[PDB]
Design a protein around this motif. Structure first.
Motif, PDB file in Angstrom:
ATOM      1  N   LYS A   1       0.875  -1.167   0.000  1.00  0.00           N
ATOM      2  CA  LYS A   1       0.000   0.000   0.000  1.00  0.00           C
ATOM      3  C   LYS A   1       0.915   1.221   0.000  1.00  0.00           C
ATOM      4  CE  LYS A   1      -3.951  -2.090   0.156  1.00  0.00           C
ATOM      5  NZ  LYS A   1      -4.942  -1.918  -0.940  1.00  0.00           N
ATOM      6  N   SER A   2       0.336   2.361   0.123  1.00  0.00           N
ATOM      7  CA  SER A   2       1.128   3.582   0.039  1.00  0.00           C
ATOM      8  C   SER A   2       2.037   3.734   1.254  1.00  0.00           C
ATOM      9  CB  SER A   2       0.218   4.805  -0.093  1.00  0.00           C
ATOM     10  OG  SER A   2      -0.563   4.987   1.075  1.00  0.00           O
ATOM     11  N   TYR A   3       1.639   3.546   2.389  1.00  0.00           N
ATOM     12  CA  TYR A   3       2.489   3.745   3.557  1.00  0.00           C
ATOM     13  C   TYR A   3       2.697   2.501   4.423  1.00  0.00           C
ATOM     14  CZ  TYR A   3      -1.848   3.882   6.234  1.00  0.00           C
ATOM     15  OH  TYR A   3      -3.048   3.567   6.832  1.00  0.00           O
ATOM     16  N   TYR A   4       2.181   1.360   3.981  1.00  0.00           N
ATOM     17  CA  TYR A   4       2.363   0.127   4.731  1.00  0.00           C
ATOM     18  C   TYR A   4       2.250  -1.072   3.810  1.00  0.00           C
ATOM     19  CZ  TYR A   4      -2.706  -0.887   4.730  1.00  0.00           C
ATOM     20  OH  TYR A   4      -3.995  -1.193   4.370  1.00  0.00           O
ATOM     21  N   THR A   5       2.956  -2.135   4.164  1.00  0.00           N
ATOM     22  CA  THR A   5       2.959  -3.357   3.381  1.00  0.00           C
ATOM     23  C   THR A   5       2.593  -4.521   4.286  1.00  0.00           C
ATOM     24  OG1 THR A   5       4.690  -2.555   1.864  1.00  0.00           O
ATOM     25  CG2 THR A   5       4.398  -4.941   2.025  1.00  0.00           C
ATOM     26  N   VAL A   6       1.785  -5.439   3.766  1.00  0.00           N
ATOM     27  CA  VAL A   6       1.390  -6.620   4.521  1.00  0.00           C
ATOM     28  C   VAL A   6       1.944  -7.819   3.777  1.00  0.00           C
ATOM     29  CG1 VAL A   6      -0.488  -8.111   5.262  1.00  0.00           C
ATOM     30  CG2 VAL A   6      -0.726  -5.634   5.451  1.00  0.00           C
TER      31      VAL A   6
ATOM     32  N   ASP B   1      11.133   7.939  13.373  1.00  0.00           N
ATOM     33  CA  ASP B   1      11.686   7.606  14.679  1.00  0.00           C
ATOM     34  C   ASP B   1      11.461   8.818  15.591  1.00  0.00           C
ATOM     35  OD1 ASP B   1      14.601   9.214  14.509  1.00  0.00           O
ATOM     36  OD2 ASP B   1      13.906   8.425  12.577  1.00  0.00           O
ATOM     37  N   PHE B   2      10.981   8.563  16.803  1.00  0.00           N
ATOM     38  CA  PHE B   2      10.694   9.625  17.762  1.00  0.00           C
ATOM     39  C   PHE B   2       9.620  10.530  17.173  1.00  0.00           C
ATOM     40  CE2 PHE B   2      15.037   8.452  19.058  1.00  0.00           C
ATOM     41  CZ  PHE B   2      14.825   8.258  20.422  1.00  0.00           C
ATOM     42  N   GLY B   3       8.867   9.992  16.215  1.00  0.00           N
ATOM     43  CA  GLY B   3       7.818  10.764  15.569  1.00  0.00           C
ATOM     44  C   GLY B   3       6.437  10.175  15.774  1.00  0.00           C
ATOM     45  N   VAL B   4       5.482  10.667  14.995  1.00  0.00           N
ATOM     46  CA  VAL B   4       4.100  10.216  15.075  1.00  0.00           C
ATOM     47  C   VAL B   4       3.571   9.905  13.679  1.00  0.00           C
ATOM     48  CG1 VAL B   4       3.636  11.526  17.161  1.00  0.00           C
ATOM     49  CG2 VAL B   4       3.358  12.600  14.930  1.00  0.00           C
ATOM     50  N   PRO B   5       2.472   9.138  13.590  1.00  0.00           N
ATOM     51  CA  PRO B   5       1.905   8.805  12.278  1.00  0.00           C
ATOM     52  C   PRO B   5       1.380  10.071  11.591  1.00  0.00           C
ATOM     53  CG  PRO B   5       1.250   7.196  13.903  1.00  0.00           C
ATOM     54  CD  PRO B   5       1.805   8.373  14.660  1.00  0.00           C
ATOM     55  N   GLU B   6       1.121   9.982  10.288  1.00  0.00           N
ATOM     56  CA  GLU B   6       0.607  11.117   9.513  1.00  0.00           C
ATOM     57  C   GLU B   6      -0.639  11.685  10.175  1.00  0.00           C
ATOM     58  OE1 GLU B   6       1.323  12.139   5.838  1.00  0.00           O
ATOM     59  OE2 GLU B   6       3.300  11.520   6.597  1.00  0.00           O
ATOM     60  N   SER B   7      -1.522  10.787  10.599  1.00  0.00           N
ATOM     61  CA  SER B   7      -2.770  11.182  11.235  1.00  0.00           C
ATOM     62  C   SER B   7      -3.360  10.008  12.000  1.00  0.00           C
ATOM     63  CB  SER B   7      -3.779  11.616  10.169  1.00  0.00           C
ATOM     64  OG  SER B   7      -4.103  10.515   9.331  1.00  0.00           O
ATOM     65  N   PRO B   8      -4.338  10.279  12.876  1.00  0.00           N
ATOM     66  CA  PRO B   8      -4.952   9.185  13.626  1.00  0.00           C
ATOM     67  C   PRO B   8      -5.557   8.215  12.615  1.00  0.00           C
ATOM     68  CG  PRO B   8      -5.366  11.218  14.749  1.00  0.00           C
ATOM     69  CD  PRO B   8      -4.777  11.587  13.398  1.00  0.00           C
ATOM     70  N   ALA B   9      -6.066   8.772  11.517  1.00  0.00           N
ATOM     71  CA  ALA B   9      -6.683   7.979  10.460  1.00  0.00           C
ATOM     72  C   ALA B   9      -5.749   6.913   9.897  1.00  0.00           C
ATOM     73  CB  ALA B   9      -7.161   8.888   9.338  1.00  0.00           C
ATOM     74  N   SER B  10      -4.572   7.321   9.446  1.00  0.00           N
ATOM     75  CA  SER B  10      -3.643   6.360   8.876  1.00  0.00           C
ATOM     76  C   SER B  10      -3.174   5.332   9.909  1.00  0.00           C
ATOM     77  CB  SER B  10      -2.442   7.081   8.252  1.00  0.00           C
ATOM     78  OG  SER B  10      -1.741   7.839   9.213  1.00  0.00           O
TER      79      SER B  10
ATOM     80  N   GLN C   1     -13.915   5.759   6.396  1.00  0.00           N
ATOM     81  CA  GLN C   1     -13.338   7.096   6.378  1.00  0.00           C
ATOM     82  C   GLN C   1     -11.830   7.065   6.604  1.00  0.00           C
ATOM     83  OE1 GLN C   1     -15.848   9.451   9.184  1.00  0.00           O
ATOM     84  NE2 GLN C   1     -17.419   7.964   8.575  1.00  0.00           N
ATOM     85  N   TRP C   2     -11.390   6.326   7.619  1.00  0.00           N
ATOM     86  CA  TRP C   2      -9.960   6.228   7.905  1.00  0.00           C
ATOM     87  C   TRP C   2      -9.222   5.714   6.678  1.00  0.00           C
ATOM     88  CZ3 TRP C   2     -10.960   2.870  12.860  1.00  0.00           C
ATOM     89  CH2 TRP C   2     -11.527   3.685  13.856  1.00  0.00           C
ATOM     90  N   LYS C   3      -9.783   4.687   6.051  1.00  0.00           N
ATOM     91  CA  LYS C   3      -9.182   4.098   4.864  1.00  0.00           C
ATOM     92  C   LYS C   3      -8.996   5.156   3.776  1.00  0.00           C
ATOM     93  CE  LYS C   3      -9.778   0.307   1.581  1.00  0.00           C
ATOM     94  NZ  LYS C   3     -10.696  -0.746   1.059  1.00  0.00           N
ATOM     95  N   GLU C   4     -10.020   5.984   3.582  1.00  0.00           N
ATOM     96  CA  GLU C   4      -9.965   7.046   2.585  1.00  0.00           C
ATOM     97  C   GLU C   4      -8.902   8.079   2.954  1.00  0.00           C
ATOM     98  OE1 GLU C   4     -12.455   7.540  -0.377  1.00  0.00           O
ATOM     99  OE2 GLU C   4     -11.942   5.439   0.026  1.00  0.00           O
ATOM    100  N   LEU C   5      -9.008   8.620   4.163  1.00  0.00           N
ATOM    101  CA  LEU C   5      -8.076   9.630   4.657  1.00  0.00           C
ATOM    102  C   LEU C   5      -6.624   9.171   4.739  1.00  0.00           C
ATOM    103  CD1 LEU C   5     -10.874  10.542   5.279  1.00  0.00           C
ATOM    104  CD2 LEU C   5     -10.134  11.242   7.560  1.00  0.00           C
TER     105      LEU C   5
END
Ligand code: 512
Length: 297
Positions: free
Chosen positions: A149-154, A180-189, A289-293
């Motif tokens: 996927k765009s930001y993750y792979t399974v 690292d020492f960071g946060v995800p793009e959004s709660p959605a992703s 919605q999360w999937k879309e965002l």
């Protein structure tokens, strides 16, 4: 009420203070085995070690040490194994652990290389035709397929115990855009990814505990587990107000040091839980919605 507390902390912009308070109150147990001279090369970070009481023991008379902890959340009734990114010499140990603990899923929250450095060894095959054999632990690992996927792979992997020739399917969830020492793009992703892991059944109590790791296995990994446990607690009681996020983090820290490395990761945990609560309480639509965002496509 986490949402009220969140607004209150944000208003007075005192996340740093709240976070440091947790650090001050966090448990402190010995990590003697981890500090033994013979295990020096089994640790990626000098200051990140598993407590002796909750460390995962490899089933071998030689050396049973691996930098991994069992976070057993009694109340939530769910367990996770948090570990450091395997080193070039501990990949066999890593998979030995996965096998012995009967894990069905492995959650990776970092990339092999970050900020120009190797934060984790390449412990899984990148191509079907080139499987991996860990001679020291007598295990074979083959890539069966992978959904990028765009930001993750399974990835679907096949782990085989060469000694017994028994075979098991291991699901690999690789989040590739969490700094690292960071946060995800959004709660959605983040929630989109978490629910992917959930929907795979890898967290089911009929399987061994899911293995979660980043580079050190405490910052990003801690954030992931805190959010999940909070949502599970809330889910079992169907009462979002019954969960005390800080209290749960402290409970988790009884099993592994430094879970959640920055005040912002803590703040992000609140965000994720608050948003995730919508699904828990019957708003099935938010998942779409999360999937879309998340823009995974
Ligand atoms: O997961 C995190 O946010 C931070 O984990 C890390 C820790 Br503790 C020490 S170095 C490091 C890293 O990612 O290089």
């Amino acid at each position: 009420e986490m949402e009220k507390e969140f607004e209150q902390i944000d208003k007075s912009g005192s996340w740093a203070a709240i976070y440091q308070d947790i650090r001050h109150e966090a448990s402190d147990f010995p990590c003697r085995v981890a500090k033994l001279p013979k295990n020096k090369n089994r640790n990626r970070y000098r200051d990140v070690s598993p407590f002796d009481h909750s460390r995962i023991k490899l089933h071998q008379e030689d050396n049973d040490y691996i930098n991994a902890s069992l976070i057993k959340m009694e109340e939530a009734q769910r367990s996770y194994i948090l570990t450091q990114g395997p080193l070039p010499n501990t990949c066999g140990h890593f998979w030995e652990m996965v096998w012995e603990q009967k894990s069905r899923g492995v959650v990776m929250l970092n990339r092999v290389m970050e900020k120009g450095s190797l934060k984790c060894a390449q412990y899984w095959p990148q191509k079907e035709e080139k499987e991996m054999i860990f001679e020291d632990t007598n295990l074979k690992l083959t890539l069966i397929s992978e959904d990028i996927k765009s930001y993750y792979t399974v990835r679907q992997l096949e782990l085989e115990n060469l000694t017994t020739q028994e075979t098991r399917e291991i699901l690999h969830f690789h989040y590739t855009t969490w700094p690292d020492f960071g946060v995800p793009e959004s709660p959605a992703s983040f929630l989109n990814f978490l629910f992917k892991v959930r929907e795979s059944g890898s967290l089911s109590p009929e399987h061994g505990p899911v293995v979660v790791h980043c580079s050190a296995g405490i910052g990003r990994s801690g954030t992931f587990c805190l959010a999940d446990t909070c949502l599970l607690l809330m889910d079992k009681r169907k009462d979002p107000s019954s969960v005390d996020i800080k209290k749960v983090l402290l409970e988790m820290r009884k099993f592994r040091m430094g879970l959640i490395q920055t005040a912002d990761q803590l703040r992000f945990s609140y965000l994720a839980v608050i948003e995730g609560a919508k699904f828990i309480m019957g708003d099935s639509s938010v998942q779409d919605q999360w999937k879309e965002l998340s823009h995974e496509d």
